[PDB]
Write an enzyme that holds these catalytic residues in place. Structure first.
Site, PDB file in Angstrom:
ATOM      1  N   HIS A 176     -12.311   0.992  -5.305  1.00 49.16           N
ATOM      2  CA  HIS A 176     -10.997   0.345  -5.396  1.00 49.16           C
ATOM      3  C   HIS A 176     -10.677  -0.632  -4.269  1.00 49.16           C
ATOM      4  O   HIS A 176      -9.743  -1.405  -4.390  1.00 49.16           O
ATOM      5  CB  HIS A 176      -9.864   1.390  -5.501  1.00 49.16           C
ATOM      6  CG  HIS A 176      -9.387   1.908  -4.184  1.00 49.16           C
ATOM      7  ND1 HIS A 176     -10.040   2.904  -3.495  1.00 49.16           N
ATOM      8  CD2 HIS A 176      -8.320   1.562  -3.428  1.00 49.16           C
ATOM      9  CE1 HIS A 176      -9.405   3.140  -2.363  1.00 49.16           C
ATOM     10  NE2 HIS A 176      -8.353   2.341  -2.299  1.00 49.16           N
ATOM     11  N   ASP A 177     -11.415  -0.563  -3.164  1.00 44.90           N
ATOM     12  CA  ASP A 177     -11.272  -1.514  -2.066  1.00 44.90           C
ATOM     13  C   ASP A 177     -12.620  -2.121  -1.638  1.00 44.90           C
ATOM     14  O   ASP A 177     -12.719  -2.684  -0.568  1.00 44.90           O
ATOM     15  CB  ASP A 177     -10.641  -0.854  -0.835  1.00 44.90           C
ATOM     16  CG  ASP A 177      -9.122  -0.741  -0.911  1.00 44.90           C
ATOM     17  OD1 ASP A 177      -8.436  -1.617  -1.494  1.00 44.90           O
ATOM     18  OD2 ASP A 177      -8.623   0.241  -0.324  1.00 44.90           O
TER      19      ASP A 177
ATOM     20  N   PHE B 298       7.922   3.123   5.602  1.00 42.67           N
ATOM     21  CA  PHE B 298       6.983   3.140   4.483  1.00 42.67           C
ATOM     22  C   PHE B 298       7.119   4.422   3.676  1.00 42.67           C
ATOM     23  O   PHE B 298       7.133   4.385   2.458  1.00 42.67           O
ATOM     24  CB  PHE B 298       5.542   2.988   4.989  1.00 42.67           C
ATOM     25  CG  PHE B 298       4.525   2.804   3.885  1.00 42.67           C
ATOM     26  CD1 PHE B 298       4.697   1.821   2.920  1.00 42.67           C
ATOM     27  CD2 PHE B 298       3.405   3.606   3.816  1.00 42.67           C
ATOM     28  CE1 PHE B 298       3.781   1.650   1.909  1.00 42.67           C
ATOM     29  CE2 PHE B 298       2.475   3.429   2.798  1.00 42.67           C
ATOM     30  CZ  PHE B 298       2.672   2.455   1.849  1.00 42.67           C
TER      31      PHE B 298
ATOM     32  N   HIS C 174     -12.266   5.292   3.860  1.00 47.53           N
ATOM     33  CA  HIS C 174     -11.026   5.260   3.057  1.00 47.53           C
ATOM     34  C   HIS C 174     -11.311   5.452   1.577  1.00 47.53           C
ATOM     35  O   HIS C 174     -10.603   6.186   0.873  1.00 47.53           O
ATOM     36  CB  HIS C 174     -10.255   3.962   3.314  1.00 47.53           C
ATOM     37  CG  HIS C 174      -9.135   3.700   2.340  1.00 47.53           C
ATOM     38  ND1 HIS C 174      -8.007   4.490   2.260  1.00 47.53           N
ATOM     39  CD2 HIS C 174      -8.979   2.726   1.407  1.00 47.53           C
ATOM     40  CE1 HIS C 174      -7.200   4.009   1.325  1.00 47.53           C
ATOM     41  NE2 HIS C 174      -7.771   2.943   0.785  1.00 47.53           N
TER      42      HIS C 174
ATOM     43  N   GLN D  44       5.834   3.725   9.820  1.00 48.36           N
ATOM     44  CA  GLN D  44       5.359   4.797   8.960  1.00 48.36           C
ATOM     45  C   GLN D  44       6.551   5.452   8.268  1.00 48.36           C
ATOM     46  O   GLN D  44       6.518   5.701   7.069  1.00 48.36           O
ATOM     47  CB  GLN D  44       4.516   5.797   9.749  1.00 48.36           C
ATOM     48  CG  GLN D  44       3.116   5.259  10.143  1.00 48.36           C
ATOM     49  CD  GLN D  44       2.313   4.761   8.950  1.00 48.36           C
ATOM     50  OE1 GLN D  44       2.104   5.487   7.977  1.00 48.36           O
ATOM     51  NE2 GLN D  44       1.869   3.517   9.014  1.00 48.36           N
TER      52      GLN D  44
ATOM     53  N   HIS E 183      -9.915  -0.298   5.816  1.00 48.84           N
ATOM     54  CA  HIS E 183     -10.482  -0.485   4.481  1.00 48.84           C
ATOM     55  C   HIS E 183     -12.000  -0.539   4.491  1.00 48.84           C
ATOM     56  O   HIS E 183     -12.631  -1.535   4.100  1.00 48.84           O
ATOM     57  CB  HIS E 183      -9.870  -1.701   3.830  1.00 48.84           C
ATOM     58  CG  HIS E 183      -8.426  -1.515   3.495  1.00 48.84           C
ATOM     59  ND1 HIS E 183      -7.410  -2.078   4.231  1.00 48.84           N
ATOM     60  CD2 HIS E 183      -7.834  -0.813   2.504  1.00 48.84           C
ATOM     61  CE1 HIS E 183      -6.248  -1.723   3.706  1.00 48.84           C
ATOM     62  NE2 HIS E 183      -6.480  -0.955   2.655  1.00 48.84           N
TER      63      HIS E 183
HETATM   64  N1  LIG Z   1       4.095  -0.298   6.001  1.00 55.37           N
HETATM   65  C1  LIG Z   1       3.430  -0.563   5.099  1.00 55.37           C
HETATM   66  C2  LIG Z   1       2.605  -0.867   3.977  1.00 55.37           C
HETATM   67  C3  LIG Z   1       3.008  -1.807   3.052  1.00 55.37           C
HETATM   68  C4  LIG Z   1       2.188  -2.094   1.970  1.00 55.37           C
HETATM   69  C5  LIG Z   1       0.968  -1.441   1.807  1.00 55.37           C
HETATM   70  O1  LIG Z   1       0.190  -1.754   0.715  1.00 55.37           O
HETATM   71  C6  LIG Z   1      -1.098  -1.388   0.453  1.00 55.37           C
HETATM   72  C7  LIG Z   1      -1.327  -0.112  -0.046  1.00 55.37           C
HETATM   73  C8  LIG Z   1      -2.621   0.310  -0.313  1.00 55.37           C
HETATM   74  C9  LIG Z   1      -3.668  -0.561  -0.069  1.00 55.37           C
HETATM   75  C10 LIG Z   1      -3.447  -1.807   0.417  1.00 55.37           C
HETATM   76  C11 LIG Z   1      -2.165  -2.254   0.691  1.00 55.37           C
HETATM   77  C12 LIG Z   1      -4.742  -2.534   0.579  1.00 55.37           C
HETATM   78  O2  LIG Z   1      -5.713  -1.630  -0.010  1.00 55.37           O
HETATM   79  B1  LIG Z   1      -5.127  -0.331  -0.263  1.00 55.37           B
HETATM   80  O3  LIG Z   1      -5.586   0.657   0.669  1.00 55.37           O
HETATM   81  C13 LIG Z   1       0.572  -0.491   2.746  1.00 55.37           C
HETATM   82  C14 LIG Z   1       1.389  -0.217   3.831  1.00 55.37           C
HETATM   83  C15 LIG Z   1       1.016   0.758   4.808  1.00 55.37           C
HETATM   84  N2  LIG Z   1       0.726   1.530   5.618  1.00 55.37           N
HETATM   85 MG   LIG Z   2      -6.426  -1.932  -1.941  1.00 55.85          MG
HETATM   86 ZN   LIG Z   3      -6.975   1.651  -0.708  1.00 56.38          ZN
END
Ligand SMILES: N#Cc1ccc(Oc2ccc3c(c2)COB3O)cc1C#N
Ligand SMILES: [Mg+2]
Ligand SMILES: [Zn+2]
EC number: 3.1.4.53
Length: 323
Positions: free
Chosen positions: A113-114, A285, A77, A282, A73
């Site tokens: 967004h992050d 997911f 990204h 992966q 992050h």
């Molecule tokens: N397994 C699993 C898995 C589970 C949840 C997840 O959630 C997210 C999704 C997008 C973002 C974030 C968390 C934080 O900021 B964003 O980039 C990502 C993964 C993965 N890989």
């Molecule tokens: Mg995020």
């Molecule tokens: Zn993100």
């Protein structure tokens, strides 16, 4: 170098631009580089009367508020998600559907967004009684924070890239940006997807094959899902890219898990480096989240996402074969 960078940027409007290379040739300023390129390409500086000075000053500060020490992050990204949002906005089935303000909002949302991500999940911040968790009642903790930081930076000197929007445009863009950044909270995924499925079950399409999005709620629901798709686009990229992203996310996961262990917490799913399978994670997911999302997106914009989904499915099977 300038030539190398220009060469990578030939792929600006293409899925699987190599943002890793962009970061290399722009002295590790991929977010500033790609945002400037995108805004030049869509004429957004002209349309919204943003000077390059103001824009580059905002983008440099924004990129400086991504943590370079966090493995995934970070601003690479953000850049990737901004560029992917830029590609998705130009999907043929969506031609002429969105306003200039919606396009601006989506790309800006994707860029911020992050921002200021600590490199741990919302559940970690919640389980450790973080100040942020407290501030936001455990609700979309990081996503509320990203918004708060991304917007606050607009008030810094020479940073207000929305100064020449009308008042109603400024108010509407703020609401839409909020909506799209909040849509990256995995807690909202199932409801987003249910709404996307409804969108698809009841879609209205012109003779040319373009989607008809009458009301604002329909438009923002597609834009939310679009940014969420772009955020979860890593598995849909060419395998050499996706593998690079996987390395980064697992490094970030393993760091959180190390923190949980040292704090005597139960380690989170996929964060224990001694027992985690990168490949298994992966595949799970993709099977449970990414594929259902992108298959629904593909249905909405058929046939425009055919290659993306094919790439997703191929990458899924490749990782599964590596288990
Ligand atoms: N397994 C699993 C898995 C589970 C949840 C997840 O959630 C997210 C999704 C997008 C973002 C974030 C968390 C934080 O900021 B964003 O980039 C990502 C993964 C993965 N890989
Ligand atoms: Mg995020
Ligand atoms: Zn993100």
């Amino acid at each position: 170098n300038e030539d190398h960078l220009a060469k990578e940027l030939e792929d600006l409007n293409k899925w699987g631009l190599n943002i890793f290379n962009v970061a290399g040739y722009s002295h590790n300023r991929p977010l500033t580089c790609i945002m400037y390129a995108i805004f030049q390409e869509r004429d957004l500086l002209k349309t919204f009367r943003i000077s390059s000075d103001t824009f580059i000053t905002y983008m440099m500060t924004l990129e400086d508020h991504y943590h370079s020490d966090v493995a995934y992050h970070n601003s690479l990204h953000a850049a990737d998600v901004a560029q992917s949002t830029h590609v998705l906005l130009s999907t043929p089935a969506l031609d002429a559907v969105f306003t200039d303000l919606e396009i601006l909002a989506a790309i800006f949302a994707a860029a911020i967004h992050d921002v200021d991500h600590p490199g741990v999940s919302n559940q970690f911040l919640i389980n450790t009684n973080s100040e942020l968790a407290l501030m936001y009642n455990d609700e979309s903790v990081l996503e509320n924070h990203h918004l708060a930081v991304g917007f606050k930076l607009l008030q810094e000197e020479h940073c207000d890239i929305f100064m020449n929007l009308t008042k109603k445009q400024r108010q509407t863009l703020r609401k839409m940006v909020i909506d799209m950044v909040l849509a990256t909270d995995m807690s909202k995924h199932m409801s987003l997807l249910a709404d996307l499925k409804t969108m698809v079950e009841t879609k209205k399409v012109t003779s040319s094959g373009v989607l008809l999005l009458d009301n604002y709620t329909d438009r923002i629901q597609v834009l939310r899902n679009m940014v969420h798709c772009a955020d979860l686009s890593n598995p849909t990229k060419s395998l050499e890219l996706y593998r690079q992203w996987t390395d980064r996310i697992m490094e970030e996961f393993f760091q959180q898990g190390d923190k949980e262990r040292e704090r005597g917490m139960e380690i989170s799913p996929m964060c224990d480096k001694h027992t985690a399978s990168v490949e298994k994670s992966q595949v799970g997911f993709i099977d449970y989240i990414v594929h259902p999302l992108w298959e629904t997106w593909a249905d909405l914009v058929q046939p425009d996402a055919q290659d993306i989904l094919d790439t997703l499915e191929d990458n899924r099977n490749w990782y599964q074969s590596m288990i």
